[PDB]
Design a protein around this ligand. Sequence first.
Ligand code: DB5
Lengths: 225, 227
Amino acid sequence: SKGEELFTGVVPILVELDGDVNGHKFSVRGEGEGDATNGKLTLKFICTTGKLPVPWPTLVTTLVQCFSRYPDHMKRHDFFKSAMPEGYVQERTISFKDDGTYKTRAEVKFEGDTLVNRIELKGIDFKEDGNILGHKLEYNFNSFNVYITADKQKNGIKANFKIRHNVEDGSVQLADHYQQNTPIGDGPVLLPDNHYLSTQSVLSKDPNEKRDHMVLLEFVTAAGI
Amino acid sequence: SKGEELFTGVVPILVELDGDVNGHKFSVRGEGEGDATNGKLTLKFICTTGKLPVPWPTLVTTLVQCFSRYPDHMKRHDFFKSAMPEGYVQERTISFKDDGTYKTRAEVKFEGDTLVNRIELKGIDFKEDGNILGHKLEYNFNSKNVYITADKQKNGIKANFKIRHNVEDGSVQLADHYQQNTPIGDGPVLLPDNHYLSTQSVLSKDPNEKRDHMVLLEFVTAAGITH
Ligand SMILES: *C(=O)O[C@H]1CCCCCc2c1nnn2*
């Protein structure tokens, strides 16, 4: 595709999230860069409103699947780069088992040379002193295949997948993800055959950063064809 | 500790493993470097005998907890660096649920300026078309925080923990780990209060390497004590 040409080389990234979980309002801003040729992303996120009222790991999935490395024989199945530069809308419902739900809506698009992810997040029905609002999750992120399928009727894609957040006592907090993406622009996009994305993620801290924050390194590849 | 002084800066690492799984002998050699100040390890491992007869992810835990980043308030709980340069013995039993068992014995010590992990591994009772010998595990590595306790009777530490390996069909292969570490030398070591290590790992391939191999990037930190 012509949109793929925008991801040769290193691309700067900006992420903006405005959030409300059980009435706790917050904002996150992230910056960094992406190298789709190697499937590599490096970002630093800051909570600009003070302390994050939820664990950082619970926002990883919400906080740019266009930086996935598609091998040569699968280039024609890359919807995400296909929609660029005009971009796509990404919406999810994330259901935390025995706890609350996030609903997210993002626009992912180029603004000049920068790939921008602007997100609104609303969370409801979280338990005070549950794993989320009680901050009981380990600072890490487990890797599992995310299966992508075409959504012909919306000219886009969908995905449903399960994230398992490790809990401080050795238990597991399931977060069921339901995802739909659709192009912002008109003009042709690539609708894929079934395949998957695989991401390996490292969460860390900048020792000089005083604000509540997350440093994130990811390596993402597509396979399954 | 005085041994922690050896881990300011970047330290070269050598890993040597001699293995026998169900009678199938193999060897692995790894090289790279560790930066305990940032909890960062980068290594490349090669199977020097040809094709690895087990999946690479099953050897991750066997293939240097002395590179963990202990924060300032927890420095007195770092047994691993405390035993250096003379080092420690690290022994495990790894039970693969409904499958075989690895038994490992390693020495982790300085030889000159290089931190060296030399390991012998014996594996028994594996199923020939089970997840291990049948190569059915995904090329990745998920982990939970590993809880460390003192083992005062051995002047060292122990840990018991679970690794869950993703299987190609969507199932999970559990590997139950039992670990004991004891110092090689006679000098004083640090015996910790209960805490945990958190390791996050990325597995990859070097596109120019022709041998069967694993590139490994890890970030490791200690936490779980307030003070
Ligand atoms: C903690 O044990 O996490 C496990 C949960 C069960 C196995 C499948 C989900 C998984 C795990 N690790 N990462 N994903």
